[PDB]
Each structure stands twice: as C-alpha cells, then as structure tokens.
Amino acid sequence: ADCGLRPLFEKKSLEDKTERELLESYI
Amino acid sequence: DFEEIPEEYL
Amino acid sequence: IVEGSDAEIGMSPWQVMLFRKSPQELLCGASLISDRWVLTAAHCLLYPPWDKNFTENDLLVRIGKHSRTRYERNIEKISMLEKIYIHPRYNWRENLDRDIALMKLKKPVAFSDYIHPVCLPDRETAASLLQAGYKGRVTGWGNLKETGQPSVLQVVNLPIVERPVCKDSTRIRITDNMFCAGYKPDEGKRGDACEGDSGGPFVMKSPFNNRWYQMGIVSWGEGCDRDGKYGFYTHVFRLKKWIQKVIDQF
Numbered sequence: 001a002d003c004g005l006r007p008l009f010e011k012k013s014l015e016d017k018t019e020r021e022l023l024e025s026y027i
Numbered sequence: 028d029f030e031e032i033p034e035e036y037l
Numbered sequence: 038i039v040e041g042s043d044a045e046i047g048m049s050p051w052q053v054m055l056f057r058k059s060p061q062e063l064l065c066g067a068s069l070i071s072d073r074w075v076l077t078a079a080h081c082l083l084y085p086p087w088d089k090n091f092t093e094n095d096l097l098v099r100i101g102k103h104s105r106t107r108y109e110r111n112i113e114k115i116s117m118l119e120k121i122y123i124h125p126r127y128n129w130r131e132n133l134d135r136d137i138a139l140m141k142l143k144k145p146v147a148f149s150d151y152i153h154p155v156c157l158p159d160r161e162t163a164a165s166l167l168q169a170g171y172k173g174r175v176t177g178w179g180n181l182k183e184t185g186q187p188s189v190l191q192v193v194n195l196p197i198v199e200r201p202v203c204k205d206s207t208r209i210r211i212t213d214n215m216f217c218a219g220y221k222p223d224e225g226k227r228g229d230a231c232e233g234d235s236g237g238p239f240v241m242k243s244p245f246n247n248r249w250y251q252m253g254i255v256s257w258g259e260g261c262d263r264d265g266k267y268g269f270y271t272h273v274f275r276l277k278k279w280i281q282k283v284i285d286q287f
C-alpha cells in the first residue's frame with residue numbers, strides 16, 4: 001500500500017548510491 | 028561472533 | 038555477497054535476518070512483505086539431505102538491521118514466529134523447485150525509518166521487469182568469498198540472464214519457477230550471493246511507480262561467483278497465488 005517506498009530514500013526524494021545503475025538497465 | 032540479544036527472546 | 042559493497046543505512050528496510058536460537062547463528066536472509074509476514078526460501082527451513090528441519094521455536098527474525106553481529110539497540114526488532122508455511126510441492130529431492138516459505142510473526146512489527154515492507158509483483162510488473170539484461174539487487178550478510186564475513190549488510194546489483202544461458206551453465210534441471218542472474222565471464226563485472234545469503238530478496242525498482250518489488254528469492258548456485266555459473270532465484274510472481282492463498286486463509 002505504502003509498500004516499496006523507503007522512508008529514507010523515496011519518501012524524501014533521495015536516491016541511493018547505485019539505484020541509477022538499475023534504472024539505466026531498464027531499456 | 029554475535030553479540031548477545033536480550034534474554035526474553037531466548 | 039561476493040564483490041558487493043556496504044549497504045547504506047535504510048537502503049533495504051525489508052531485509053530480514055533468520056537467526057538460530059541455539060547455537061546463535063545466521064541461518065539465512067528473508068524479507069518483510071507486511072506487518073506480520075516474512076518471505077524466505079523453503080530450503081532455509083527444510084532440507085532433509087543435511088538433516089535440516091527447523092520449527093517455529095528454533096528461530097527468530099531480526100528486522101531493521103545493518104550490522105551483522107551487533108545487537109542494534111533501539112533500531113532492530115526481534116520477532117518470534119507463530120507458524121511456518123512451506124510450499125506443498127517444494128522439491129528438495131531433485132532441483133529445489135518452488136523454493137519458497139512464508140513465516141507468520143507472533144505479533145505485527147511497527148514500521149520505522151529502518152523497517153518497511155517491499156511490494157510483491159503483479160503480472161504486469163513481472164512481465165515488464167523480468168527481462169534479460171535488466172538489473173536487480175541482492176542483499177545479505179552472507180560470506181564474502183566461496184572459500185570472510187562482512188561487518189554490515191552487503192549489496193550487489195546483477196543482471197537477469199537469458200533462460201538458455203542459465204540452462205547450459207548447469208546439470209540441474211531448471212524449471213519455470215526459477216530464474217538466474219549474474220554477469221557472464223566476458224562482461225568484466227563480478228558478483229553473486231554466497232552461503233548465508235539464501236532466502237534473501239532479489240529486488241527491482243519499477244520505473245513506472247518508483248516502488249521496489251521483490252522479484253526473486255536467493256535459492257541456489259554452484260559455489261559463489263564462479264566464472265560461467267549463475268545464481269538461481271525462486272520466481273516470486275509464478276508462486277504468488279500460493280502466497281495469496283496462505284495469507285487469505287491464515
């Protein structure tokens with residue numbers, strides 16, 4: 001419901017150090 | 028090398 | 038995790054540690070899917086060839102952790118299990134087919150900055166994200182090398198591998214309930230789960246709604262981070278109807 005939205009990252013609009021690598025792979 | 032956890036759980 | 042890096046604080050707030058009561062040891066990873074349900078690999082609990090057959094009272098779950106060995110006072114929550122449910126057609130004799138178990142917590146855990154559930158995929162999310170070359174993320178406190186142990190939670194990002202390449206890497210019979218992941222020997226990047234990471238989550242972040250979904254469960258592999266070998270993962274979506282059946286009924 002609130003699932004999969006991290007309080008210290010998505011909920012604050014902050015990205016972790018390597019999540020971009022995943023996103024860049026989703027072509 | 029695990030630190031002991033509170034007694035109630037064991 | 039082999040060739041990973043230290044996780045950031047709160048990076049994987051659904052990560053769960055399966056911890057044996059006596060002797061005190063790390064058994065496996067697991068994941069938090071709601072306030073009272075934990076998902077893991079069946080073989081973490083039941084594996085007769087190694088005389089492994091754990092019951093509810095043998096184990097604790099530790100949630101919100103970062104350090105492997107420290108008791109993270111005021112941060113982690115330790116829960117007891119009410120009931121374990123193993124897939125009725127878990128195939129431990131041949132190939133670890135349907136390597137999935139649910140664990141119901143005795144009481145709901147409160148969410149926090151460090152404790153938050155991951156989403157389970159629906160058909161559409163699985164269809165669009167489970168594609169060769171797309172990367173997912175594995176986390177755990179398992180060994181750093183096949184033949185030591187990390188101080189904090191480790192993280193590695195790994196691409197999903199095409200099914201024929203998975204099939205041709207092993208003599209084990211692969212099923213539709215598994216997928217494999219990892220770099221090929223020519224790709225010049227490394228990384229794998231290892232002993233102690235089993236039962237942990239393989240997650241992906243949807244670019245549509247920005248949520249994290251658990252697509253896999255660390256299931257098996259031949260050694261850790263061997264060239265030409267891949268990690269195998271239980272296909273969570275293919276087993277979702279069983280998941281929903283157990284949660285609805287119990």
Ligand SMILES: N=C(N)N1CCC[C@@H](CNC(=O)C[C@H](NS(=O)(=O)c2ccc3ccccc3c2)C(=O)N(CC(=O)O)C2CC2)C1
Binds near residue numbers: 259261267
């Ligand atoms: N390298 C990765 N990713 N993995 C997963 C985490 C542990 C990592 C290291 N673990 C291992 O190397 C041991 C074994 N590999 S195997 O080749 O012996 C094998 C494989 C498949 C089998 C299938 C059916 C029956 C017997 C099987 C036996 C394995 O992956 N297992 C699951 C586990 O360890 O939790 C053991 C239960 C057999 C390997």
Ligand SMILES: *[C@@H]1O[C@H](CO)[C@@H](O)[C@H](O)[C@H]1NC(C)=O
Binds near residue numbers: 085090092
């Ligand atoms: C595992 O343990 C349970 C509970 O004691 C028992 O009923 C069951 O027969 C065991 N299964 C195997 C395969 O040993």
Ligand code: NA
Binds near residue numbers: 205207208209
């Ligand atoms: Na083969």
Ligand code: NA
Binds near residue numbers: 219229262
């Ligand atoms: Na490999």
